[PDB]
Design a protein around this ligand. Structure first.
Ligand code: CLA
Ligand code: CLA
Ligand code: CLA
Ligand code: CLA
Ligand code: CLA
Ligand code: CLA
Ligand code: CLA
Ligand code: CLA
Ligand SMILES: C/C(C=C=C1C(C)(C)C[C@H](O)C[C@@]1(C)O)=C/C=C/C(C)=C/C=C/C=C(C)/C=C/C=C(/C=C/[C@@]12O[C@]1(C)C[C@@H](O)CC2(C)C)CO
Ligand SMILES: CC(/C=C/C=C(C)/C=C/[C@@]12O[C@]1(C)C[C@@H](O)CC2(C)C)=C\C=C\C=C(C)\C=C\C=C(C)\C=C\[C@@]12O[C@]1(C)C[C@@H](O)CC2(C)C
Lengths: 85, 166, 73, 164
């Protein structure tokens, strides 16, 4: 326990007992891939092609949800990297 | 060090389990999740895939106690969700799975429930530990084979239209 | 809803000549994006507000699973 | 493990031994919040008795009716509206008169379900094992009736066929 921290990086326990054991070399590239996929899904559902009732595409929607997620994945990747993991 | 993959080292979380531990985890998923949760998921997939493979094969051969059951297990899904059978099976499956959350949560927390154990042996096919371990290994091997077989069955029966050979 | 063809609930919304409380110029849709106001009542579309509350319901039900309880997550 | 109904789960702490009908069935752990099992058992037994009476009334109204015309409706849910409000208000007042004294009784007593109702003295002379067996019979039958009366209501609301 003791999620409180004062050093350079928080302890790996703040990532939960599922991300605490992911190597940073896995989280990092996974975070970048998720960010790219989410940005592309957002730019394909909108921006590049205007949205319409007949075109919603749960893949692009679910995808776009990987952009907010990506943020968390690379934050966890940095936390793991600084904690020698 | 691994028994399944001689090149890669043995997984750290896989030492011995009567579930068929041959040390096959190249991506190290056992480090991610607790081994017990992954074992429960694997056994659930095994049982679902075995039931599904048997049902697909049988329902294409002899399944017509009525009119709406005159389908080829490929258009069966839509026809029988329109009929209402899949709704009932989903209701009972949801009840069983909602109970299974507590079963999965009672393990991973304490208790003594082994992964995939529901104390369902009404006919007592397994008697002692040796039979239990042997048939656990047999069930998991059959379930993995059934997973791959059902994957092949659906992919082939969607890549073409045919019967049992697919 | 079960088939996933959720666009069907938005097809054929209330027209611009719909008299509120009457079937003249009405539609069959129940969840739509229209924006703005009803041309007659000068108020938000009822189908707009139903869709709004459905979205809010889904979001809040999802957000209500955040904190830990007796099931380890 | 300790649940008989769900042989795999361990029952909660308050499900043990006494309070007949205890099969360890509390997966959601509702018993963990109640201070005791007295009130929940009282509510369960009241539901069991009301559901038994409801199922019996459902079947009898399906087959047997009072001589008057106002009681000639076969569908129980339609008879809920066809029957004059006088009969229903009399039934409700009778139930409330029975319910107020038991309202004083239930929230404080050790056996709130024990209303002292035994006009035929079916329990006088029975041993403890026989009494517990009778309690188990009552609870079983009541749970089955509850399921059955809810099913009857659902099938009447969904198909209009009050029976079968
Ligand atoms: C400057 C911004 C900033 C920074 C640097 C941090 C930093 C941190 N937060 Mg944090 N947080 C922030 C803003 C920030 N927070 C805000 C604005 C909120 C909302 C109020 C939160 C809510 C939050 C929670 C609830 C938790 C953290 C946690 C953490 C720690 C681990 C994070 C991690 O790897 O999760 C990686 C997470 C994932 C890979 C999952 C995906 C998460 C995405 C973003 C959710 C998307 C949905 C959402 C609605 C949008 C770390 C110290 C954790 C902690 O300290 O544990 C004790 C934790 O449990 N944060
Ligand atoms: C994962 C398990 C699973 C699932 C989801 C289904 C699902 C289905 N089965 Mg089925 N089935 C299964 C296992 C399964 N089966 C097994 C193991 C057997 C062998 C006993 C069968 C034998 C079987 C027959 C004989 C028939 C179905 C039929 C059906 C369909 C309608 C449901 C119904 O009335 O029968 C439940 C539905 C798509 C019916 C259908 O329309 O198929 C053509 C039908 O007539 N099943
Ligand atoms: C090759 C088939 C096969 C085999 C050998 C087993 C073997 C086993 N299962 Mg099992 N199971 C299977 C398929 C199989 N399963 C399928 C398809 C389902 C889905 C309905 C289940 C659902 C299931 C549950 C819910 C439970 C078991 C349990 C068990 C164990 C004790 C019961 C027993 O001896 O079953 C012997 C089975 C056979 C000899 C198959 C004969 C059927 C002919 C058709 C044992 C290791 C219990 C357990 O986990 O104990 C550890 C338990 O609670 N099984
Ligand atoms: C590989 C397994 C598999 C797959 C791919 C599907 C896929 C599907 N099922 Mg399904 N189903 C399965 C197994 C599967 N099922 C099993 C094992 C059962 C129980 C035996 C059911 C019972 C079931 C029912 C009862 C229904 C479906 C429906 C559907 C469709 C609706 C999906 C949707 O739009 O979400 C909708 C999204 C939400 C509801 C919320 C998000 C979809 C094509 C529905 C349908 O009408 O299909 C045409 C439907 O009503 N399924
Ligand atoms: C009014 C309904 C009602 C109530 C108040 C109780 C109350 C009780 N039951 Mg019980 N039971 C009921 C109905 C009910 N039961 C039915 C219908 C069955 C048959 C399946 C059972 C089978 C049963 C067993 C086998 C056992 C109990 C036990 C218990 C006791 C401990 C559990 C507890 O605290 O839960 C309190 C329960 C509630 C507060 C009810 C909450 C309402 C939930 C949310 C139900 C939601 C609806 C449901 C999912 C579906 C209903 C629709 C339809 C399909 C029927 C407690 C006195 C245990 C015992 O004896 O301990 C002493 C025990 O082992 N019950
Ligand atoms: C939950 C309990 C319950 C409730 C709320 C009702 C409610 C009703 N019953 Mg009824 N009934 C019940 C149990 C119940 N019954 C049982 C257990 C039986 C079998 C003896 C009957 C036999 C019965 C008949 C034969 C008739 C009704 C009828 C009616 C309706 C008019 C009231 C009347 O004449 O009662 C009459 C009540 C009785 C003759 C017996 C009551 C026995 C009580 C419950 C025992 C304690 C006193 C009313 C909706 C009448 C109606 O409109 O038909 C649709 C009618 O003709 N009931
Ligand atoms: C004036 C009539 C009256 C009164 C005072 C009571 C009083 C009581 N009933 Mg009761 N009941 C009645 C009529 C009445 N009942 C009728 C007609 C039925 C149908 C046969 C029931 C069926 C019933 C069951 C199945 C249960 C109770 C329970 C209770 C107790 C708690 C009720 C509660 O939470 O308050 C609620 C407060 C309100 C103001 C209720 C208003 C609800 C609206 C008016 C519904 C319409 C209490 C002793 C419970 C009990 O004793 O558990 C131990 C219990 O489980 N009652
Ligand atoms: C107690 C067990 C039981 C039994 C034997 C039946 C038996 C039957 N039900 Mg049923 N049902 C039950 C519980 C039960 N139901 C429950 C608990 C519910 C939910 C409250 C339902 C909801 C239900 C519906 C909605 C329908 C049935 C229907 C049917 C009939 C087909 C058959 C007579 C169907 C029927 O034919 O209605 C007349 C139908 O439409 N039932
Ligand atoms: C009356 C009727 C139909 C009809 C008729 C007539 C009157 C007869 C004749 C007329 O001519 C026509 C007609 C229509 O009227 C009968 C219908 C058939 C029934 C009643 C059979 C039901 C099938 C059961 C299935 C298909 C269940 C599948 C099992 C699953 C289990 C899932 C699990 O994942 C769970 C949840 C936990 C995991 O741990 C492991 C397992 C257990 C694998 C789903 O994966
Ligand atoms: C009534 C009953 C018991 C009544 C007992 C009473 C009043 C006893 C009272 C007394 O002992 C006391 C209290 C104290 C004693 O000193 C005095 C007396 C007076 C002697 C049990 C019913 C118990 C009733 C039960 C268990 C009913 C189960 C019903 C089922 C399964 C029905 C299923 C279906 O209805 C569906 C679901 C759908 C339909 O379409 C198809 C079918 C199949 C018909």
């Amino acid at each position: 326990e003791s999620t409180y921290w004062e050093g350079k990086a928080p302890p790996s326990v703040v990532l939960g007992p599922f991300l605490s054991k992911i190597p940073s070399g896995v989280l990092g590239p996974a975070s970048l891939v998720a960010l790219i996929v989410g940005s592309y899904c957002t730019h394909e559902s909108n921006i590049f092609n205007t949205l319409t009732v007949d075109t919603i595409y749960p893949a692009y929607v679910l995808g776009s949800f990987l952009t907010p997620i990506s943020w968390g994945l690379h934050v966890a990747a940095w936390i793991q990297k600084m904690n020698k993991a | 060090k691994s028994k399944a993959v001689p090149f890669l080292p043995r997984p750290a979380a896989l030492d011995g389990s009567v579930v068929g531990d041959v040390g096959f985890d190249p991506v190290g998923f056992t480090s991610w999740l607790p081994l017990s949760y992954l074992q429960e998921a694997e056994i659930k997939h095994c049982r679902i895939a075995m039931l599904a493979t048997l049902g697909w094969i049988v329902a294409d051969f002899v399944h017509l106690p009525g009119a709406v059951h005159e389908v080829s297990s490929l258009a069966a899904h839509d026809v029988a969700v329109k009929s209402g059978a899949l709704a009932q099976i989903l209701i009972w499956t949801s009840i069983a799975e909602a109970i299974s959350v507590i079963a999965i949560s009672q393990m991973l927390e304490g208790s003594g429930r082994q992964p995939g154990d529901f104390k369902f042996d009404p006919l007592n096919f397994a008697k002692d530990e040796k039979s239990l371990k042997k048939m656990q290994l047999s069930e998991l091997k059959n379930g993995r084979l059934a997973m791959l077989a059902f994957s092949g069955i659906v992919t082939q029966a969607a890549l073409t239209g045919h019967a049992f050979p697919y | 809803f079960f088939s996933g063809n959720w666009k069907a609930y938005a097809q054929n919304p209330d027209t611009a000549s719909h008299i509120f409380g009457s079937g003249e110029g009405s539609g069959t849709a129940i969840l739509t994006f229209l924006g703005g106001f009803h041309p007659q009542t000068k108020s938000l579309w009822l189908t707009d507000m139903a869709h709004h509350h459905l979205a809010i319901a889904v979001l809040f039900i999802v957000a209500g699973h955040m904190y830990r309880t007796n099931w380890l997550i | 493990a300790q649940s008989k109904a769900l042989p795999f789960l361990k029952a909660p702490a308050k499900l043990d031994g006494s309070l007949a009908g205890d099969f360890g069935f509390d997966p959601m752990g509702i018993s963990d919040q109640v201070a005791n099992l007295k009130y929940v058992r009282a509510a369960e037994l009241k539901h069991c008795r009301v559901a038994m009476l409801g199922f019996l009334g459902w079947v009898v109204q399906q087959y047997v009716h009072l001589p008057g015309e106002i009681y000639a409706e076969s569908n129980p849910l339609k008879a809920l509206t066809s029957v004059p409000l006088l009969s229903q208000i009399q039934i409700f007042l009778f139930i409330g008169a029975i319910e107020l004294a038991t309202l004083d009784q239930t929230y404080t007593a050790d056996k709130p379900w024990d209303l002292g109702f035994d006009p035929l003295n079916f329990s006088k002379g029975k041993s403890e094992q026989q009494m517990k067996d009778l309690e188990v019979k009552e609870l079983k039958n009541g749970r089955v009736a509850m399921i059955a009366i809810m099913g009857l209501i659902a099938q009447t609301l969904y198909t209009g066929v009050p029976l079968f």
